[PDB]
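INPUT
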Amino acid sequence: RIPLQIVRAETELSAEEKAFLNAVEKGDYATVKQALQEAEIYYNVNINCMDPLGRSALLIAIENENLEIMELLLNHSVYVGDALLYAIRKEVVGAVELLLSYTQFSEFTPDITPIMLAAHTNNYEIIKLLVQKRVTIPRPHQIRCNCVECVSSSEVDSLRHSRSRLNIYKALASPSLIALSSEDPILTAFRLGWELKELSKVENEFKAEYEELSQQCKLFAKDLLDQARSSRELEIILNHRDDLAKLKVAIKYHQKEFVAQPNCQQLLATLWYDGFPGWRRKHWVVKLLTCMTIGFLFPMLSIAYLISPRSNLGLFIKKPFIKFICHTASYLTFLFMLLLASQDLHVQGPPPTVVEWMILPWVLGFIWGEIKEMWDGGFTEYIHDWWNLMDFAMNSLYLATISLKIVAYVKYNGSRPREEWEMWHPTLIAEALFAISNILSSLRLISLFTANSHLGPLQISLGRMLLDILKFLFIYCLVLLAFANGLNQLYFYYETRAIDEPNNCKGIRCEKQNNAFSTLFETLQSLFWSVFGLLNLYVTNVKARHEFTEFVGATMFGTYNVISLVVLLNMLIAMMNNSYQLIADHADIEWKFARTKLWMSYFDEGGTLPPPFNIISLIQNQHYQEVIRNLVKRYVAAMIRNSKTTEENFKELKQDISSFRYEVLDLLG
Amino acid sequence: GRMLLDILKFLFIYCLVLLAFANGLNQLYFYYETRAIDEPNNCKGIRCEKQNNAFSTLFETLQSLFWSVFGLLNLYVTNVKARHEFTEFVGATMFGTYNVISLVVLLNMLIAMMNNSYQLIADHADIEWKFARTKLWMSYFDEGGTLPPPFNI
Amino acid sequence: RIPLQIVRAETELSAEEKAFLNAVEKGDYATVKQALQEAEIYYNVNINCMDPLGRSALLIAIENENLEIMELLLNHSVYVGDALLYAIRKEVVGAVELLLSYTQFSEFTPDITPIMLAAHTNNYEIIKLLVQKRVTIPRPHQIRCNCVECVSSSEVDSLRHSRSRLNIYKALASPSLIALSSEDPILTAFRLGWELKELSKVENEFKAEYEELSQQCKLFAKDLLDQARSSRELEIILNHRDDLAKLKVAIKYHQKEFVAQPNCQQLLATLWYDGFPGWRRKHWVVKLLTCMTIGFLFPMLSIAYLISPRSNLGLFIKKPFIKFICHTASYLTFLFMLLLASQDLHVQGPPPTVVEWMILPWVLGFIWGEIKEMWDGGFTEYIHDWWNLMDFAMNSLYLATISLKIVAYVKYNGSRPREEWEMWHPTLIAEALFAISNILSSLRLISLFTANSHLGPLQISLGRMLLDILKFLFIYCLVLLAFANGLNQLYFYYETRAIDEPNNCKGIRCEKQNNAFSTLFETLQSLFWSVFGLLNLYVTNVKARHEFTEFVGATMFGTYNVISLVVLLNMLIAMMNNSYQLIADHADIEWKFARTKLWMSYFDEGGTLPPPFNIISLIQNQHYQEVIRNLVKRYVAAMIRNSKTTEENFKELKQDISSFRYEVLDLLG
Amino acid sequence: EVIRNLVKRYVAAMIRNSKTTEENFKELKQDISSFRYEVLDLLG
Amino acid sequence: NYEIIKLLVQKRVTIPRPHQIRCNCVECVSSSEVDSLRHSRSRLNIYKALA
Ligand SMILES: CC(C)CCC[C@@H](C)[C@H]1CC[C@H]2[C@@H]3CC=C4C[C@@H](OC(=O)CCC(=O)O)CC[C@]4(C)[C@H]3CC[C@]12C
Ligand SMILES: CC(C)CCC[C@@H](C)[C@H]1CC[C@H]2[C@@H]3CC=C4C[C@@H](OC(=O)CCC(=O)O)CC[C@]4(C)[C@H]3CC[C@]12C
Ligand SMILES: Clc1ccc(Cn2c(CN3CCCC3)nc3ccccc32)cc1
Ligand SMILES: Clc1ccc(Cn2c(CN3CCCC3)nc3ccccc32)cc1
Ligand SMILES: [Ca+2]
Ligand SMILES: [Ca+2]
Ligand SMILES: [Zn+2]
Ligand SMILES: [Zn+2]
Ligand SMILES: [Zn+2]
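OUTPUT
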């Protein structure tokens, strides 16, 4: 048998104390009043005694929402320590008002204060009541602060310091506490969410709590925007300066839900189709014909803007959608010329052809536009855009091409057949670089999928899955390098000269593959091509009769095949499935944020002409404050309605019924 | 690592199917075994430029059926020098049934199992990783083994 | 503007009728009583008037659970038609008892009766109250009944007939109505669930409702089994005759949940490990060593059973687990001999070797065991097992092999080299058939995965996904046949003789593939092998300079590749994913049912010896009734507890409070 | 006529389905408090 | 709510007719240009009422 006793004993209550606590629980006002009056005289009952659950009489009265018994206990001067915190957590306005007018165990940490707890409960009534007085919340220090106080607190007690910081940020990120006590609730929500996201990044632990607090701030900003009821209010909000300034700030803080607001998107769409008033209601054929017409007329629009910007055609290109169409048409003509550029080849360093002469101004315009964007935007913004990396690569390659061409033009005059050219001849390197540049230039069209409704979210999904692909590539490369090292170690003894080969061809790119694993570089290439099955099996064979060596090499090759294809590739498929399912929910918001950034990029005056043509306050504050006041009122009302539309409710109902029953029985009897 | 368990579970039935078809193909083809001298380059087996004797012995049949999973086994290996077209057709049918089972059926079922297991274990990945990392960190708290090789000797 | 009016007008209530209905809704007993007494004299208020929702005063009283006002209305003789149905649906015992003691619109169809509605509500109290009287439910006819009444009702009104049949089956399948009024609740649940499943199969519409009713009956049987509290009760239940007879009946009706009951499984496990009392608590190595020892000693156990069944070794094989081990060991030795059978070949029809002579008794034993199982079990049971099909194939092939061998032995004596043998020589056909038989024999080991905990549910999952594979194979074959027809139509003009080929080899199984699409059979084979990439591209090339024909053939081949691989194979993967996710939940129950069938197959005396050694009542009814009574009581109590542990509840609370308030105000004032 | 029958049946069925929140508990408390105040006024 | 809807329809109540989906009258374009948010909200409210 297992004897069961009380290992951690406490102080039991007497019979009279238990009876008094039972009377308090049942809500019998008369018996509780008699017990208090008798305790004043006989001192037989301790009014501050706890229960087996640790609650005192005052805590029992608070938990039952019994205001009469609460006031009766308060009038008899019972212990009140931390009772206000319990009243606030219970979210009972009457208890809070009663207690405001006036080391034991506690359910609240020592750093919790009444205003902080009210903010944690996000109860607008109690938060407003506490802010009516002079209450303050301590300022959290910098995320990476290194002052003496922060390091001293961290070293003395890391748990307490982290808990206090989390409690402070829970208090500040309260939507009700931001609705009050905040000059600009929208900007406060933006920056508070950004700081919470940064804290989530920095704090490896407590990451989920900071992430959810940041998400809560983002949702509060979105709902405040949702409360707008007219286009005038929306324009006032988005144009406020601390045009579309606040929208730009929201984009800066990655407020995807705020930007993808349907009314914000509608306003941005009206700005986007400046020229066409009825683009929303048109047939597919009409839109396609209009887009084709504007694309084919892009040089005329660019020339008209160059000559006279103030005309029906001069300023027609400054419209965002028209500007986008013209830039896309210019890039498409550039790609068409790139395709045509491959339609005498023995000249060493030939002069550029007509197609190359037409291509050159586009390349110069691309370089000039890149450096102009670099100057106008800045450094950090330029480097934050990943597409710019590709642009840089393209430009560099093109520049290299030009350089090499010039070199080949000045260093060579004779016409020698390409068969006997040097391997590192300038023309061959220039042509290879130009081909790579063509590949990258055509691949640059992916970024335009954002402008499309059907292609945008798909591109978002693929870009997000590229992260899982990158994660898997590391372990794949580790396995590939391991097996390459092993196969090269095994096979490098049987390396044969190219002369001994049947066609004087050495390597795996010959008709009969040979020396697949002779060198580490060739072993890497062989193991790569085996993924796609282009490496034949007889490459694991050697001229000598070393059948054990051939079998071991074949076994290494087979194990590599099994791992890379059966195991790693299926695991990659499973990871992609999971990630795509995870990101399918938020694809629309991500796409709309990306498309909003694309649209905003075409609102600026700079960069109007596509290549190659580019180389040739108090009242506003008062209006914003009035609109913000209206939005805050509407948001508070809506959230109260949503909250209004548990076991403690049934406990309160029972308490009310019992109190009424005792009152009636006392009045009658 | 957790999906490796599903891989191990699937490997048993795959090996059963592979052994069955290897037994059948060897039983059918072991009569037409040819010497290495008769081969065009004195090379016998499937690791030659022209594959031959793919199903002559049980070991070679196992290797041929393994390499057929990755497509490195050519079709003409189901051909014999004699004019036994029925035997060649039956051997080719056995090879094709093995291909259908191992690739179309077994591999897709393995993919489905991996999907289910990965979805199941995605929820608790963080706790498992933190437990493993805690064990790794604790392994470096002890005085013993401070010096890495070769300084430990 | 859209004018809004009442298109379907009704009869509005007067002011006094509306006031009376409001008084009834509020529960004011005094005003309702006064209104009734005044209506008796002045006839100014219609006591049977409806409301805008169609409810009368009696229906309002019933819906509020106001028994006092209900009785007051009943004492004044108000219209009571269909009020009992509303009382039953409300599941109020007091209303039902009041109404039992005593063409307008109705919420219940005309075929609904009080007992049927009570069964639909599955309320044990009301069902018992109605069954206390003499109530009956009409018998549904046969599922495929063809009497005059059924066809007449179906032709006159199919909707009404189907609705009435569904209502009757909803009534009968009520767990409370089966707990009462049923001699054998378990057998009734089994057969009722089976019949509901058959109706679901037959009725293309209403399939989901019959499926859920059948599932409900299965769950009721499982819960009744769950209520057993001792092994004596469980043995009495499972051994009842209308051993393990009721368990066999449950297996017959595919009661998977009933069979996979943990207590049923525990009893079956104790029966399964008859010899070993402590097999549950043993190490893996001990179990493996014991299994290997018993497997290696299987011939000794078989011989001991043959000689003297009554000994420590004679009856040691009759134990189910030992019998399974011996049969598995015998089959494994047979497969080992099959493997050894491939270790002079110029003899036409050679005599059987030592390995073949050892194989022959195993084949004879397999055939004898198959026919013995066919005789002992029956025809329908034998053909219902799909594995038997494979067995049949194996046996047939083996028989064919033997026949051909005999033919080749008697028809040929000379030793001619195999190179110049006929294509259809008996020896070649016999060897091909034997190889196919070996493949099938080794593949037969899949059925033993059921006996394993880790391999069982996996086999269940793969078997269930084979259905999706079969479904996909139809459309794949349609596409394959279409493209084969097209490619053959295009290419059959350029068929070349085998002599013209470089090595006198014609077809795709040559070193240089040729005539890939010349004939329909060869086109089918080429398109099949292209799925696995073994068909080379140059097969779409012809000797003539018909570049258009070659391009069109290559385009057909490429379209076939795109469809079969990119489209069809990925769709197959998606289908397999969905089906595996769907069937992962019930894998354990399916596996345990299959394993129970496997275990039961080894409980019988017949078939004890594996090949080749196989060729050398009133008191019981009273006990079952007592146990069933105990189970029914426990099940009723448990289900009532589970149900006890809506807006109408709050409406009833408000009604009670208002009635109390009116009573107090009348008593005081 | 058929549409009238269908509309009646649909209305009844949807009302039944809707019948079969914190504001409900607030209303219950309000009713109890009103009854309590009425009784206390009537007695006292 | 069927009860309240019936009570209000007992009187003479009307709901404004929404225009064509691709209507191009002067009133629609004027309302869209003056306040797109208000016009869209009113159209959505009308269609919520009718449906
Ligand atoms: C598929 C092969 C033939 C490559 C074709 C290359 C280009 C001709 C395609 C690739 C991506 C296409 C672009 C994808 C995105 C859009 C957005 C599209 O706009 C919309 O879809 C919605 C209306 C709007 O832009 O506001 C305008 C066409 C455009 C530039 C497309 C123009 C044609 C592009 C450049
Ligand atoms: C993987 C390759 C080498 C093929 C091996 C073929 C056989 C040697 C394997 C295949 C399936 C195996 C069987 C799968 C199922 C079982 C159940 C197993 O029992 C259990 O797992 C739980 C204990 C119990 O049976 O009650 C006993 C071994 C046995 C017959 C296995 C014996 C060994 C078998 C026949
Ligand atoms: Cl070699 C290259 C270099 C840079 C770039 C980047 N870049 C683009 C590309 N856009 C045009 C359609 C898809 C994205 N337009 C530009 C206009 C001005 C400056 C840079 C520009 C593309 C290609
Ligand atoms: Cl050629 C063959 C024919 C039939 C069969 C069916 N069969 C089996 C197969 N069992 C043994 C282990 C896995 C399933 N045992 C038997 C005992 C008696 C009778 C038939 C029997 C297998 C192979
Ligand atoms: Ca750029
Ligand atoms: Ca059988
Ligand atoms: Zn600090
Ligand atoms: Zn009938
Ligand atoms: Zn209009």
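end of record. Residues C 141, 145, 147, 149-150 surround zinc ion (ligand 8) (CB under 6 Å).
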